[PDB]
Nucleic acid binder design. Structure first.
Ligand SMILES: [Zn+2]
Length: 86
RNA sequence: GUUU
């Protein structure tokens, strides 16, 4: 516990600041593959929750990607395997 | 700080 399924070829990205949009994240992660979707999680009024997910069409090594130290806006993004809690 |  907690029960969760690890989502293949998807990376959790947290520490997403308000000036970082989906397109900027896609442009960075394109170094790893053909990005299928970047989704920043927002509440129903479009307030970002400050985290999102990047998924790929190609198989990627999520463990290697999450070692990356990515710093756009002065803080390291917080990366992890993507889990859907069940 | 893990998507419904
Ligand atoms: Zn930027």
């Amino acid at each position: 516990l907690p029960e969760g399924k690890i989502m293949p070829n998807t990376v959790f990205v947290g520490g997403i600041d308000v000036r970082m949009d989906e397109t900027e994240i896609r442009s960075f992660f394109a170094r790893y593959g053909s990005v299928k979707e970047v989704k920043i999680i927002t509440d129903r009024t479009g307030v970002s929750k400050g985290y999102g997910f990047v998924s790929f069409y190609n198989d990627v090594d999520v463990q290697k990607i999450v070692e990356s130290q990515i710093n756009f806006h002065g803080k390291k993004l917080k990366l992890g395997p993507a889990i859907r809690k069940q």
